[PDB]
Amino acid sequence: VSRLTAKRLQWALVYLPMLVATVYFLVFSADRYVSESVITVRQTSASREDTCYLQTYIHSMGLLQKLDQQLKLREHFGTPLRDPLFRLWGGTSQEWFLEYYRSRVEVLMDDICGLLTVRVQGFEPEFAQALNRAILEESERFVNELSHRMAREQGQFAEAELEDAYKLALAAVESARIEATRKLKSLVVVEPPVLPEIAEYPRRWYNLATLLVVCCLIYGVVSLVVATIRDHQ
Amino acid sequence: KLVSRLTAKRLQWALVYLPMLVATVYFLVFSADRYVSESVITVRQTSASREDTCYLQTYIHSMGLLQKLDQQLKLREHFGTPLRDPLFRLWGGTSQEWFLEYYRSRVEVLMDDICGLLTVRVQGFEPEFAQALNRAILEESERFVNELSHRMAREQGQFAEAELERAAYKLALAAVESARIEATRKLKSLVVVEPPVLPEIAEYPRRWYNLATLLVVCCLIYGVVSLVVATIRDHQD
Amino acid sequence: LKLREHFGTPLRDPLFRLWGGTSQEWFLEYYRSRVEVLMDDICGLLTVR
Amino acid sequence: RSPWQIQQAVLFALFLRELKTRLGGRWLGVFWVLLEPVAHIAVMTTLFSLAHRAAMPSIEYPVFLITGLIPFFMFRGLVTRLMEAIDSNRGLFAYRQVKPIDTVIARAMLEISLQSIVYLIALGTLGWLGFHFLPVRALELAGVSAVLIMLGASLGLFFAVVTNEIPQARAIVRISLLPLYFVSGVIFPVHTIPPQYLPLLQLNPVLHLIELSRASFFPQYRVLQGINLAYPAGFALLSLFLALMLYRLRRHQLAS
Ligand SMILES: CCCCCCCCCCCC(=O)O[C@@H](COC(=O)CCCCCCCCCC)COP(=O)(O)OC[C@H](O)CO[C@@]1(C(=O)O)C[C@H](O)[C@@H](O)[C@H]([C@@H](O)CO)O1
């Protein structure tokens, strides 16, 4: 109707949201350095099920507990006090911490060759590199321990069973212990974690231009709609 | 207050001609030639192997290979040589991520899965530098596909040494000999079908092609802004 | 673990509590409702919530 | 009177008029509208139940086809019925209140109401037969559906405005609509599609909307790489802007 004048429409549709967005993106947003590593799991002398474990162990909660107890991620992500959106507020719930960690660490699996890439965000490039290295090391240790547990459970039966019977018992014990001690599988590192120089997040001008286009289009649509409505007299 | 100014001729000269004259005078004069050296390789196991080729396809664009190459060949100084073509030169003092983006755009890797081959095309402002860069890429790629299995061989040899330390004895010695054989053997060889060539005439500054796309994009922009101006004029009746 | 004893504790909620002396089949249906098992096709991992 | 109240008057008038003409008077068209989805299910499920069970064993076929079909039927109707809106009401285009925008809005409202009713009926039937019929995430599904509404209505208005003359061109609309049933992920999951056809397949906004709706419907549904809401949302916004501008240019030329 007559209340929605053009000046009010453009002030409330393209001017004010862009002003708020540019203020936030230039004076409040915090840089987020990203470190990327590319890995695969190989069996030392099919393998899709081996690397499919890592796609859900990286986002698992136990790995998050290990990481925090190691590198203290909880107070690192709360350091930037200027940005209220991408910081981790103190005293938040454990589930929110897990969701935030899952948002920070991004895992892509390319299935044409089973290549797994991990991109880790942080507020200091050295911290991001250290977090990526810790994730790789813990994943390798876990994929080792997965077979280690089965081999030692086999060995427990062999030691519980214990002169042909004695000979086969000691042979089985030797096989079980060489299974429980060996290095069953190793994680091949196609691209080791890198130390970034600048932060690629957030790319401020991209969202500024995109959102400017969005508000321009939205204001145009609303103005044309109200013009067509006011056509009837 | 404005629609009396932007008529057809003003808008046409603003968005169809002046940017186009700027683009032509940049491409035909200011742009710098970029020579292209092309090689065709694949990986076959000595004595399928698509996974090795995909590891290589990832490794060509990897950051570590870029660090090794620039150190060996001083890529940053070479790519900053032509001051005539900035829109395609590597400005000094830029970040490592922009350096990675520039290197990724300057090297093209093509998979061919029907027949199983990798094509590497490298652009450089001099042909000899492009050929040398292609050769360095090939040799570092072969070294990488060697070390990838050398690491696992050494990793098994560590347990072989642990087993000899535990102790039967001749079995442990044979296992350690096999482990050091694996750690020393040339397991995988990169065979080359087309070795890198030395180009003569630059190919990638296909100026007419970019001008052809610029024609249609400027026409689209002109049409859209003309429709917007007509809408505003209709609103001002 | 006395599941039936535990699930009858919240008296404030009238729909998500387990009433007393209900049918055994209804108990089985309620237990199936509480325990969610999802099987993923690509890798075969089974998640239980 | 205010323009708003006369707007409700005229849209209610054309809405009841359009209900009259589309339903046939004796309310016979509801049987047709109800019978097309179930006939599609009966044809569709008899050849690819085993193939789908081999592909995605965790998802039932009929509910998958409901979520893939009914939004697509709604989009197809929103395009087709709104494209031919001007010619149907041509004889009554001079009452100073019957501008074409009211006609296309009335047709859009009618189609949205009818297909929403069909959606509710199909979901109730699916629940009645012992299938899974509650979306785990409801309002994201509603938002994706709203994006689909905006895109479909915008495309319909754009085609109605552009092709007021040369009605022969309307053919290359509906003839082009038939491949969109196959190429988009409606009847068979795009998981089985080879990746070498994947890039061009990503150019379809309807495929993105259908996949996102299915992901928001079922629990633990995987999305392909490159599927996003930003591309179809921008497509819908740009098409709506273009259609509104083109209607504003040729507003006075749609009267005879
Ligand atoms: C944006 C353009 C894209 C072009 C796509 C072309 C593909 C084939 C289309 C079928 C072409 C077609 O028509 O459908 C066929 C059967 O389709 C199929 O089974 C498709 C099988 C596989 C396709 C799906 C797999 C997709 C795989 C990846 C893409 C019978 O349909 P139908 O009974 O409705 O035929 C009615 C006529 O179309 C009427 O049209 C006329 C005419 O012929 O009299 C009318 C009039 O004369 C004029 O308006 C008009 C003319 O003059 C104006 O150009 O032609």
**Structural resolution in Å:** 3.4
Experimental method: cryo-EM
Q: What is the DSSP string of chain A?
A: --SS-HHHHHIIIIIHHHHHHHHHHHHT---BEEEEEEEEEEE----HHHHHHHHHHTTSHHHHHHHHHHH-HHHHTT---S-SSSS--TT--HHHHHHHHHHHEEEEEETTTTEEEEEEEESSHHHHHHHHHHHHHHHHHHHHHHHHHHHHHHHHHHHHH--HHHHHHHHHHHHHHHHHHS--EEEEEEE-----SS--B--HHHHHHHHHHHHHHHHHHHHHHHHHHHH--
Nearest to A115 by CA among B62, D208, B46, B149: B62
State both tokens at A93.
């719930």
CA pair distance B40, B167, nearest whole angstrom: 50
CA pair distance D189, D191, nearest whole angstrom: 5
Distance from CA of A31 to the nearest CA of C (A): 36
CB-based contacts of D65, cutoff 8 Å, min separation 6: D40, D41, D44, D45, D187
- Helix, strand, coil content of chain C in percent (nearest 5): 35, 10, 55
Q: Is C44 on the interface with A (CB under 8 A)?
A: yes
CB-based contacts of D55, cutoff 8 Å, min separation 6: D189, D191, D192
* Ligand 1 pocket, CB under 6 A: D 168, 171-172, 175-176, 178-179, 182-183
Q: Which of C38, C41, C42 sits opposite D219 (nearest CB)?
A: C38
Report helix, strand or coil for B175: helix
Distance from CA of A193 to the nearest CA of D (A): 23
CA pair distance D25, B181, nearest whole angstrom: 89
Nearest to D7 by CA among D146, D105, D153: D105
Inter-chain CB proximity A191 and B152 less than 8 Å: no
Q: Which of A38, A192, A198 sits opposite B97 (nearest CB)?
A: A198
Q: Is A181 on the interface with C (CB under 8 A)?
A: no
Residue position matching structure tokens 């001083």: B74
State both tokens at B38.
């092309």
CA pair distance B152, B38, nearest whole angstrom: 32
Number of H helices, E strands in chain C: 2, 2
State both tokens at D71.
């939004």
CB-based contacts of D216, cutoff 8 Å, min separation 6: D135, D136, D137, D140, D141, D144
Nearest to B146 by CA among B181, B186, B118, B178: B186
State both tokens at B163.
């087993």
DSSP D196: G
Number of H helices, E strands in chain B: 9, 4
Return the residue of A nearest to B67 by Cα.
Answer: A194
CA pair distance D60, D134, nearest whole angstrom: 13
CB-based contacts of D253, cutoff 8 Å, min separation 6: D164
Q: Is A197 on the interface with B (CB under 8 A)?
A: yes
Largest CA distance in chain A: 110
Residue C11: what are its φ and ψ, rounded to 5°? -85, -15
CA pair distance A194, B58, nearest whole angstrom: 15
CA pair distance B206, B216, nearest whole angstrom: 17
CA D170 / ligand 1 centre spacing (Å)? 12
State both tokens at C46.
């089974």
Nearest to B125 by CA among B81, B190, B156: B81
**Sheet containing B35-45: order of strands:** B107-112, B117-124, B35-45, B188-194
CA pair distance D234, D222, nearest whole angstrom: 23
> Can chain B be said to touch chain C, i.e. do they have 3 or more Cβ pairs within 8 angstroms?
no
CB-based contacts of A73, cutoff 8 Å, min separation 6: A64, A67, A101, A131
Residue D33's identity, in one-letter code, is: V
Beta bridge partners of B42: B191
Beta bridge partners of C48: C37
